[PDB]
Design a protein around this ligand. Structure first.
Ligand SMILES: COC(=O)[C@H](Cc1ccccc1)OP(=O)([O-])CNC(=O)[C@@H](NC(=O)Cc1cccc2ccccc12)C(C)C
Ligand SMILES: COC(=O)[C@H](Cc1ccccc1)OP(=O)([O-])CNC(=O)[C@@H](NC(=O)Cc1cccc2ccccc12)C(C)C
Ligand SMILES: *[C@H]1O[C@H](CO)[C@@H](O)[C@H](O)[C@@H]1O
Ligand SMILES: *[C@H]1O[C@H](CO)[C@@H](O)[C@H](O)[C@@H]1O
Ligand SMILES: *[C@H]1O[C@H](CO)[C@@H](O)[C@H](O)[C@@H]1O
Ligand SMILES: *[C@H]1O[C@H](CO)[C@@H](O)[C@H](O)[C@@H]1O
Lengths: 323, 323
């Protein structure tokens, strides 16, 4: 049976986490995103100017084209990309998916053209939301799932230190105590779960649902919760130059916690200080608005505090504090 | 209980079939497409130059915006469109869907910018393939299904004559004999069905699967079948100026038939003559290549010969020769 460990590494300010992935013999640095289900990469089909600063996949060398197939994706942050599709060998942490659909980029929005930290994205949401037309394809995980020792993957994202993606097994040395599981609603293709209540510093409130998303930098919550949190932070204010609420870097931030099936997942205030706002001397807050979408995005800021198991049997999510 | 009849009308050469749809009080002429699951329309968010020659939806007047939601779709013919989303009232044949997601176009590819025959598309494939992010929406049919007398719709597309879409009931005067049903595989979001065999003129062959698609003009089949068919047509040749095989308009074309759960659906040779090729004096064939996609597209050329019932219970498809 298979299993493997892929090492991730945060970019500046932990904006994104990249992991090497070998496709057709060429290694590319990809952003693993549990919030989408497409594996797409920079390719030789892009204008040469856009290939600069990246490792790129050449479909002609090893891929098998799916004639007539296309893909087009749009992300929450407004970026988008589109292209054609080939199948090829894809290896992640020593685990190889043969015949995996690789979506070759033919067009990419400005955001991707500016970001040289990654060469594409590897989706780990459920395959039901993969964008390939006319027939959708399975994610790397769904492709290899049956060959793994256990049909799960787990992640430990860290602050300014390498972390890991464990495939097919749980590394108990990565967390303290025992895991607590909660059921996942995959009806929208996400690893969605319910929280029974939350505590933002000195204020507590009722529950809501949200998704475990390695692909989102921040913890995005309802505006009422965001307001409630920052009302407690001395001098915090919105700064559109920075992208949201900012505050003096030396400010003491309250913790934020959520109750999930009896387990209290706590994000310490120190992790909520994301980093320099990039607008003078303030710091950007790790908690920001979810834009009114009706559900919360448990992004990297939250994930940095937990070891999380994505289990296809259930499906369900397991949580424990990172060691 | 509800039911209704919407009248469709073919454009020149039956290239597409349009039906009026009222959204927020404004009537737009839409192409009903059982091959996709998005209801999208020309809107005031498009460049003014692109609104010319169309009826357009103004979301500001009656729609409720879904903040943070987007959609992006790509069709088999290479066209694409993208935009934002609002919910509004949508009436088709006297049947009203309240709170229906209407996808307002913000960008449209050249193909749509050139086509003034329609003001958008109304998808009737299964909702599982709707493109709205972050949470997909239901098609008009899925929205109203529970209020209909029976959870089905049926279609009679005709050659150069108005046809109908029946919602929630079967009009037995539209076909001869009794309907024959066959099971539908909706795993890819299509009304997909199996044929046990086919006969192309004097040649018969083994089965394959395909989708019932009102949104595709032609009958798209595997290249081997296309070759087999045209090998029987005196002087037929490919003409890229026309888009596929062409032949002298006076040529006698063989019939094409498929066996579906014991019923023989026959497309007469006269219906396979699509019309003037638009390249001199030849005629374009109704049968053309499916581009190697691995399944057949039973488009309008085939549908013109049958009355077809799309039944959500099963699901299943019913067929009988049009009256
Ligand atoms: C399924 O979730 C998404 O698609 C998510 C969440 C979402 C969904 C719907 C609406 C809005 C957001 O977007 P996405 O996958 O595009 C998520 N993108 C990001 O997190 C990008 N990051 C950043 O952009 C850093 C960042 C900096 C400053 C302010 C921010 C305010 C909100 C979120 C991120 C901010 C990537 C560069 C890492
Ligand atoms: C789910 O099916 C689709 O998305 C289908 C079929 C498909 C799928 C995959 C690959 C190729 C094709 O494309 P679509 O929905 O874009 C289907 N488009 C059409 O039928 C367009 N029509 C025409 O373009 C007329 C037409 C003229 C000349 C040659 C043709 C050769 C093939 C098909 C149509 C031809 C629209 C103007 C009506
Ligand atoms: C992951 O688990 C597999 C199956 O037990 C091992 O073979 C592998 O070495 C790694 O520990
Ligand atoms: C990535 O790198 C880390 C640390 O270098 C290892 O722990 C892991 O096995 C993988 O090789
Ligand atoms: C469609 O069917 C409904 C329910 O029987 C009728 O009320 C309607 O007039 C139409 O015949
Ligand atoms: C569309 O128009 C046809 C014929 O004009 C009618 O049969 C149908 O009821 C609908 O009004």
């Amino acid at each position: 049976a298979a299993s493997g460990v892929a090492t991730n590494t945060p970019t500046a300010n932990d904006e994104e986490y990249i992991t090497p992935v070998t496709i057709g013999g060429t290694t590319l640095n990809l952003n693993f995103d549990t919030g989408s289900a497409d594996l797409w990469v920079f390719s030789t089909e892009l204008p040469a100017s856009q290939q600069s600063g990246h490792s790129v996949y050449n479909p002609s060398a090893t891929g098998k084209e799916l004639s007539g197939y296309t893909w087009s994706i749009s992300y929450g942050d407004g970026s988008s990309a589109s292209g054609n599709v080939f199948t090829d060998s894809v290896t992640v942490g020593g685990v190889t998916a043969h015949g995996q659909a690789v979506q070759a980029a033919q067009q990419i929005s400005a955001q991707f053209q500016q970001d040289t930290n990654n060469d594409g994205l590897l989706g780990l949401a459920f395959s039901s939301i993969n964008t390939v037309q006319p027939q959708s394809q399975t994610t790397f995980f769904d492709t290899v799932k049956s060959s793994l020792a256990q049909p799960l993957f787990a992640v430990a994202l860290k602050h300014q230190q390498p972390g890991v993606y464990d495939f097919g097994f749980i590394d108990s040395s990565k967390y303290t105590g025992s895991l607590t599981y909660t059921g996942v609603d995959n009806s929208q293709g996400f690893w969605s779960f319910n929280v029974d209540s939350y505590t933002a510093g000195s204020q507590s409130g009722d529950g809501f649902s949200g998704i475990a998303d390695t692909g989102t930098t921040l913890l995005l919550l309802d505006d009422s919760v965001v307001s409630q949190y920052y009302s407690q932070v001395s001098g915090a204010q919105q700064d559109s130059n920075a992208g949201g609420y900012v505050f003096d870097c030396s400010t003491n931030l309250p913790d934020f916690s959520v109750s999930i099936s009896g387990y209290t997942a706590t994000v310490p205030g120190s992790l909520i200080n994301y980093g320099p706002s990039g607008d003078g001397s303030t710091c950007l807050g790790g908690i920001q608005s979810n834009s009114g979408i009706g559900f919360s995005i448990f992004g990297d800021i939250f994930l940095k505090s937990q070891y999380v198991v994505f289990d296809s049997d259930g499906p369900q999510l397991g949580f424990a504090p990172q060691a």
